[PDB]
Symmetry: C3
């Protein structure tokens, strides 16, 4: 399956690989004497006590069961469906690294690492099986083995008989002991992160407009912490109110310098939290002692159009550029438009206590059918 959005956030570039092999159910198999690597998913030679061909010296095998679960039931928050996707339990007894001859792990994320969490649930259950049986077989001097050979122990007692899958070979030339090809079984440990976590708040600028191919409403931003001016990162927008179908909905302009936090410490899911005025934007009024001017402002090129509260003058002024409604507390109320205004109503009745005034320099028409006085 193709990825929608990875992100390497200042990783070593080798740290990124074996945090991406852990989430893909593959291991590396590196080869010396070449530059060829055979990446192969987690899925014999028959060295025996009786056998003449290979001489054995020591067979250590640990057989631990502390960090070996049985389930790995992993699940994550589906943004579209909001059901917290159904639990993909992985059975123990599939991918058995030690096959002899004779507790339930469960997380839930506030996010979703891959498309389906079947493969990452299989992959963590397999990388914990490799810690179950681990040891080394000190042999004498052969190049007939490889890190993925899956050899078997046959001629021994009931304790150690069965097929074991290797992890590596060590050659060990020295003066005493001659040449001793030590075999290795098992893998040491694992961190079990979906991705290497970044737990900081970062800031970024909004990047033009690009529609969301994942069919959310995610706003494509940049991050200057990355030196990637060309590539775009879709990020989620956090609003105070939002709602079902009735939101705040200002949807920031393409140069706004938002501040971005990451959900559940995954670089793949960013999220805008605020929007941050700055000296290249120059906010409508600076913060001042005697905080009297308040109110939001919308102003595209020249038309300042939003409501203002001036707490010193006790007003509430709705702008449109010259159309002010300015209902002042313990005071007056005025429409004040330099153009026409209309007041259509089914039955409008205007009433005043002990004064009225109607004016007009030119015509005044009271055009009606029945006019009473």
């Amino acid at each position: 399956s193709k990825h929608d959005q990875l992100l390497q956030f200042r990783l070593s570039d080798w740290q990124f690989i074996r945090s991406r092999l852990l989430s893909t159910n593959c291991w590396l198999l590196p080869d010396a004497a070449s530059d060829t690597v055979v990446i192969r998913p987690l899925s014999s030679r028959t060295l025996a006590r009786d056998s003449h061909d290979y001489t054995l010296y020591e067979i250590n095998l640990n057989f631990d069961n502390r960090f070996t679960p049985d389930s790995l039931s992993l699940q994550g928050w589906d943004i579209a469906a909001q059901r917290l996707t159904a639990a993909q339990k992985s059975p123990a007894g599939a991918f058995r690294p030690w096959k002899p001859a004779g507790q339930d792990y469960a997380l839930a994320f506030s996010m979703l690492p891959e498309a389906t969490l079947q493969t990452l649930s299989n992959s963590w259950l397999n990388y914990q099986q490799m810690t179950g049986v681990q040891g080394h077989i000190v042999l004498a001097g052969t190049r007939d083995f490889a890190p993925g050979e899956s050899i078997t122990l046959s001629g021994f007692g009931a304790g150690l008989d069965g097929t074991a899958m290797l992890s590596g070979v060590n050659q060990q030339f020295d003066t005493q002991y001659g040449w001793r090809s030590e075999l290795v079984i098992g893998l040491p440990a694992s961190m079990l992160e979906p991705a290497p976590p970044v737990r900081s708040l970062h800031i970024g600028t909004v990047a033009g407009f690009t529609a969301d191919p994942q069919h959310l409403d995610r706003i494509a931003i940049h991050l200057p912490a990355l030196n990637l001016p060309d590539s775009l990162i879709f990020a989620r927008l956090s609003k105070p109110w939002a709602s079902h179908a009735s939101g705040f909905c200002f949807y920031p302009e393409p140069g706004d310098e938002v501040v971005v936090g990451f959900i559940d410490s995954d670089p793949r899911y960013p999220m805008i939290l605020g929007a941050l005025h700055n000296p290249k934007n120059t906010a409508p009024f600076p913060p001042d002692e005697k905080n009297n001017r308040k109110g939001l402002i919308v102003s595209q090129a020249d038309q300042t159009q939003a409501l203002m509260i001036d707490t010193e003058e006790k007003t509430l002024r709705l702008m449109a550029g010259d159309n002010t409604l300015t209902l002042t507390g313990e005071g007056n109320l005025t429409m004040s438009t330099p153009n026409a205004l209309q007041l259509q109503a089914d039955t409008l009745g205007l009433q005043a206590d002990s004064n009225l005034s109607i004016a007009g320099k030119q015509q005044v028409e009271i055009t009606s059918a029945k006019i009473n006085m």
Copy 2:
């Protein structure tokens, strides 16, 4: 750019602060957090009907309110309410003078009108038609 929300919190407000790129040198306010020493205009309740922002310095509550149970939109100034109720009426309701200056204002109503006043009514103009 040059058109913001711009409320700029008061000097006792208990903001919540996060730090950019994990440096103590750069803090950043994210929210502002009512508290029992401030006492928010109305608590969160079942049947969330009262909404709308509020600005109130000493005694003059002055901002718009939405009451979703009554389907209103009420712009306060202390006694000057504009209160355009959905599927209902519209009223300026000011206990003082109100003015409506316009280049050519034309008010129109379908099948009723009423103009009142206990004292004087002046239709002072040059040419008055009827």
Copy 3:
């Protein structure tokens, strides 16, 4: 604030750092007369090591040489000194119905789907842009809203809503688009969209109530436009227009007053 009173947690960290002060082991020979809390004393020695020491554990150590040797242990290794094991991520959660706050704050009871706890509720604090003394933004999110939640000072006990996050199960009033012209908040319970709108392409400011629009357009007109009655009560209202006026009405027009001048 980790607990109710910080007397006990202040005593507890001071005691778990005392146990790192004196630590060692006494290799004895073979007895089951000791326990990890016995508080034994050293008496017959020199002035360096004489006094009562409280144990931490016993080790038995059967082997071929040395016989049986019950080693005693004194002291505790180290301590992390966290009030709670820290979670430093941002998580998201849904609002959970309504439940009043028993701690008498205004905390909003949410869920967290990172936990698989659909039944239990978690009270969380609400962060507003403005809030104030007694005059706030105060929208108080609806019980299904999918807020984003951060934790104060890395304690799970104190969560806090930061934003509220539209989503495909809610379907926001208009998507983000190129040519961002439609703006303005919206409140809409079932059918009555009622809040102000800014359309920067048409240069308007339109206050809805469902059919009652005030729509003062910049470099343009101003219209109340209500399909019902409207009233304009005032102490002394005076309306004035420069070089045109028009008053209409299909049925009755009353200028009912005491003294009418012309």
